[PDB]
């Protein structure tokens, strides 16, 4: 999987409450988190499926 999949989730400075997915490498799972609406990092997906397809397997 890409190394960016190993980065912690990043809400950013904006103040929306948008539910996005990130790959949690420690748990080995795609998980939900709150995205604020701007300055997304790469470990930030609109669906669990997008997250699994991108960060799923090594």
């Amino acid at each position: 999987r890409p190394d960016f999949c190993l980065e912690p989730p990043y809400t950013g400075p904006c103040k929306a409450r948008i539910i996005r997915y990130f790959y949690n490498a420690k748990a080995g799972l795609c998980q939900t988190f709150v995205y604020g609406g701007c300055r997304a990092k790469r470990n930030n997906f609109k669906s669990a499926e997008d997250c699994m397809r991108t960060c799923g397997g090594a």
Partner: protein, 237 residues
């Protein structure tokens, strides 16, 4: 909203909840303000990346207060078109504003009504009221009941002393107390900052961003509506 108190029905009739719709439920992700019977005002980053001409699964709710109960005042209308500011800059958060055209007309009453705009170029002063269903602490939970908080406006230069000169644009306005504890937070974006320095209530700001929420020395940053008055009137057609 951090450090705020419960609102009451009819207190902020211009407040909207901007929601994503699913089968069996909906999810509030931003606020918005009533401009007229067919148009709402929200932040640009609340809609960035959507299908602007044919948006699906989006609605506004007016006359809302407590999301845990049906109070009979609620009007739920889907969004039919999104007008994102043509010069919206996603990285700088410049021109962070959009309009939502509704697929039907709101009916105005004591609980649902538009908020007046300021005159173009007008500078807001003094205490302002920010409202919404955002989180009540940084990275926390959201309240069922609409929250309100009163905070003093902060000048650009003071706000720039906090964040940096190039990080606060002229068309942004800041608000909060120096000790922190009172702010807008995640889920409040797109919602109203209301001023009253002209003897009447008007929409001075749109909840946009900040360094965390309610932190000492880091007031919330807002899109300054007075810079976009002409834009709103031109596009809300």
């Amino acid at each position: 909203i951090v450090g705020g108190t419960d609102a009451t029905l009819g207190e902020f009739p211009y407040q909207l909840s901007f929601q994503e719709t699913f089968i069996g439920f909906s999810f509030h992700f931003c606020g918005a303000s009533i401009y007229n019977e067919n148009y709402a005002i929200t932040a640009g980053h609340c809609v960035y990346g959507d299908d602007y001409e044919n948006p699906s699964g989006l609605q506004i709710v007016a006359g809302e207060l407590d999301m845990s109960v049906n109070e009979g005042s609620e009007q739920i209308i889907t969004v039919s078109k999104i007008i994102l500011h043509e010069n919206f800059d996603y990285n700088l958060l410049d021109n962070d504003i959009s309009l939502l055209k509704l697929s039907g007309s709101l009916t105005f009453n004591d609980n649902v009504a538009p908020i007046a705009l300021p005159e173009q170029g007008h500078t807001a002063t003094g205490d302002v009221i920010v409202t919404g269903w955002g989180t009540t602490s940084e990275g926390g939970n959201t309240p069922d009941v609409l929250q309100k908080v009163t905070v003093p406006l902060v000048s650009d230069e003071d706000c720039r002393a906090d964040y940096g000169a190039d990080e606060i644009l002229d068309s942004m306005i800041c608000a909060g107390v120096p000790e922190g504890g009172k702010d807008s937070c995640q889920g409040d974006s797109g919602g109203p900052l209301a001023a009253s320095d002209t003897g009447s209530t008007y929409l001075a700001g749109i909840v946009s961003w900040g360094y965390g929420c309610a932190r000492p020395g880091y007031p919330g940053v807002y899109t300054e509506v007075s810079y976009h008055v002409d834009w709103i009137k031109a596009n809300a057609v």
